[model samples]
Target chain A: MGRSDSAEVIHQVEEALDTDEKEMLLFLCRDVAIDVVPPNVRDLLDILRERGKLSVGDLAELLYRVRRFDLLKRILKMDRKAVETHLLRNPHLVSDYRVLMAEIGEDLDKSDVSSLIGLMKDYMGRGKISKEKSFLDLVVELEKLNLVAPDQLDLLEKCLKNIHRIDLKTKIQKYKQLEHHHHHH
Target chain B: DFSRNLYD
Candidate 1:
């Protein structure tokens, strides 16, 4: 496809992602260091393009990682299985940590999120932790503070346990196990 | 007037 076609697809996909999904997408794009403050969807697209060719497969992978299957089907006209088949050869752009955080964010209820935010007030001053921020946003803030990373999820797990999200904490534990297993192999 | 058009 031409660059114009790609731009059109990007625009359509951008429209598909609402505020929360956009934030999740940005979180998945953590590897790309953009200087823009409160970077918009276009900024994200530009940075992704800067790294390498922004292919349909790449866009599909991003949407897939964020678990926006609705957008995947509507915008890309591709299903989860189709994307999985395509990804068999291509390496994933989104990190396992980002995907894990996204999955955890999906499982959190409103109260669970609020509880996490309340706990985060100690780390990030009360003035900084707004109620409007999604669970992923909190994770992003923690990430920026160097408190949480792919190798370091103990703080996140502790916070989850503090919020009585033992289930989510266990998810992190499992992810760490998987990471360890991959390292050995 | 332009105002009338604007209101319409």
Candidate 2:
């Protein structure tokens, strides 16, 4: 098991996450609040603590979202299988919409991402999109513009269709179906 | 640095 000392544990977890992972962690924490995200792990921990998200389970889920399973095992004393098993009973802290968008971003290769950027040039020109950003970043921009949401994925579906990613479009449809099911039951 | 006392 990991250290019992909370301050030291925080330091160790902070050291474990790289810059990119930290960015991903911050993005995953967007549901917490828009204004609470900090540039460094220590500050981020403070905000997470304030929001009552500093528990072992919360940290484990955050690590999972950032794909830091190694940290989950090393720092949290849990593996991916164990975490997934726990998640089956307890819903995820990160919103399903954010996870779906991130999954779609992960499914795209570099060329697909570049094509997406090309197709989104108008939005980029209007300063709504950033050419150098990832697919997830573009989706975040679109979300900020109210173009995509849990209930509003038409723009995302159109983008995937234009990119010739009918498979990705199917993923969106599946997410919608699941959303609908949740609404009824 | 993290290895020290990280596991018990």
Candidate 3:
């Protein structure tokens, strides 16, 4: 199916999304005319979108929230680039588990000494994660509990690297690509 | 807290 009507877009963005969903969307708002949206919120959305996708309603609200009343009135009249560019740049907008894990790997590599040490307390037991099939298997298993918070992943990746399990880092990247392809396509 | 201590 092709795009939905602007009325439907407005309803979806304004009513369908919860607070968190709305917060995530504020980033995909077009580059101009969003005076009401806070700059910090916009930046966060941009960071996350650079990595992933948001919803149609997210865009719908992005347009609605802007100070430009004419854009809303002239929604259908807007050119294709207006809609396609942001959506394409942020494939989905929300970070799926795949993106989150990959990001964890990335963030860990960039973390400071104290942060890495903090993660080691939990992950680096005497011989918890290993070099065997169990090592890769453990990453999948840890996905449910270890990845509840986005920041936790940063520490987890650092722990993996601190113990010299760099292979798992590569494996995480592969899995992320697999997941992204499956979801986006 | 300062950059000097961080370098040290």
Candidate 4:
């Protein structure tokens, strides 16, 4: 009940596109308690966190699998059919959660990549985390903090675009081009 | 790659 077990379970569950299972997988992986979890289930949970992000329906479906409909349904009061329809149309409800998960796991080293900008570079070095909730949250939080200079926001925006959120990047939408006249044309 | 065509 380790890496391989987790991988097999993840492949099966992902094709199912069960987001509830996916979310539980991630939660359990981050907070492992082997004694409480069953054998194959434990491994599946273990492997799920690294697979990729999941949308709301996907999360919901996964929840449906683990019988945690109570969490998202009767308890949270989300209607399953309506939730399913909404998610189908807009399937991007968990990138921030993904980012949040990664944010908590990182052991930041101040010497090299301490600043928010530096941390972004590190993730991009691995790959674009445009779908990462934590990064977006950081972006939102950064704006709220207003600690960085005006240019810094601009820089962060560009960095975000580079990470593959061109759809999400609105700041650099329209730029002005400067023109000048010179003596020797 | 960044070029804009007639449509753009």
Per-residue lDDT of A107-161 in model 4, one digit per residue for the tens? 2223212344555545345333333333323444444456334223355445545
Ten contiguous residues minimizing lDDT sum, candidate 1 chain A? A31-40
Which TM-score value belongs to model 2? 0.69
Better of 1 and 4 by DockQ: 4
lDDT of 2 at A133: 84
Name the docking class for model 2: incorrect
Q: Residues A1-185, candidate 1, lDDT per residue (tens digit)?
A: 33555566667777777776787666666655454525466667765665565556667767776678777667766766766566555344554666678778888887888888878778666646677887777777776677777776777888888878788888788668667435332
DockQ of 2: 0.06
Q: List the residue pairs that clash in candidate 1.
A: none
Recovered native contacts in candidate 2, as a fraction?
0.00
CA error at residue A122 for candidate 3, angstroms: 11
Over 4 Å off in model 2, which ranges?
A: A1-4, A37-39, A83-90, A122-130, A161-171, A174-185, B1-8
Q: What CA RMSD would candidate 1 show?
A: 11.4
- Residues A1-185, model 2: lDDT tens digits: 33246767777777888786766666666666674555555667666665566666767766776678787778767767777677655454555676667657767887888788766666445655555787767877876677567786787788789988998898788777667444332
| lDDT, each prediction | 0.68, 0.68, 0.40, 0.38
Give the TM-scores of the predictions, in the order they appear: 0.66, 0.69, 0.24, 0.24
Instruction: Estimate the lDDT of model 2.
Output: 0.68
